[PDB]
Every structure is written in structure tokens, then in C-alpha cells.
Amino acid sequence: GIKCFAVRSLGWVEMTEEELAPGRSSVAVNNCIRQLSYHKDLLLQLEDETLKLVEPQSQALLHAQPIISIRVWGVGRDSGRERDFAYVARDKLTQMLKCHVFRCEAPAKNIATSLHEICSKIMAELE
């Protein structure tokens, strides 16, 4: 149900399509985390198959990514980057592919895991 995570936005980095061909992808996302994360506050929310960025104090939807069009996600593969979450979606207005990095309070695998979970019950659900 309402899975909600304390995060900070660190920024984003433009990506190409060839960067996103598989296993040139996972590598690439990590450079994206490498670029923006050094080793205010948002709630990155998961509900209704939507990755939501919510202003904590106000409960005000800041941004809203349909999960199904997230190209890829990740956690910072190396050391210390266990709290770094990244995802990649085409930007709705400009049409750009972007990798958004977030530094989380709890471990970034909790979010990876909730995303898999939400995807899997949409795969097995579409039958």
C-alpha cells in the first residue's frame, strides 16, 4: 500500500537513447549518481503505480511519474552510495530523457524493491 520514503533531490542529468541500451544502461545510471552525489526534503511516494514527489509539510503533489514509463532505476552500486536512488524518465514537456538522483534517509534498495514489487503485480496482473 502507501509506501513512502524520505528523500532529498540532488538534481538530474540528461541521457541519450544509446546510453539506455541494456547493459550500457546500468553502467550509465551509475555515472549519473557519481556526478551529482557526494560521499529541503521530499517524500518520494509510491501509490497508484505513480512515483510521486510530495512536499512533506503541505502534502502537496510536486511531481508525478507514471511508473510504467520509468526507463530504469538503480541504487548507487559502489560503497557509501547505499542511500542514493536514481530513476530515468522522458520529460513530458521537453521530451528529454533524464536521470533524477535522490539521496535517501533509509537505504535506496527499499525503493528499488518496492518498484519491482509494483511492476511485478502489474505484469502478472495484465493477463
Structural class estimated from helices and strands: alpha+beta
**What is the strand arrangement across the widest sheet?**
4-3-2-1-7-6-5
Q: Which CATH C-level class is it?
A: Mainly Beta
Distance between the termini: 22 Å
The radius of gyration is 14 Å
H/I helix tally:
2
Measured by DSSP, the beta-strand proportion falls in 35-45%
| CATH topology grouping | PH-domain like
Q: Explain this structure to me?
A:
Residues 5-125 form the PID domain. This is Amyloid beta precursor protein binding family B member 1. The structure is a monomer. The protein has 127 residues and is of the alpha+beta class. The chain has one domain (1-127): PH-domain like (Roll). Helices cover 21% and strands 41% of the residues. The protein is built from two helices and seven strands. The protein has helices spanning 25-36, 109-123, and strands spanning 3-14, 42-47, 50-55, 60-66, 70-75, 84-90, 97-104. Strands 4-3-2-1-7-6-5 form a seven-stranded antiparallel β-sheet, sandwiched between helices. The chain is globular. The two termini are 22 Å apart.
Short description:
The chain is an alpha+beta fold and 127 residues long. Helices cover 21% and strands 41% of the residues.
List keywords for this structure.
127 residues, alpha+beta, PH-domain like, 2 helices, 7 strands, globular, Amyloid beta precursor protein binding family B member 1
Per-chain topology:
Blueprint lengths: L2 E12 L10 H12 L5 E6 L2 E6 L4 E7 L3 E6 L8 E7 L6 E8 L4 H15 L4
Antiparallel strand pairs: 1-2, 1-7, 2-3, 3-4, 5-6, 6-7
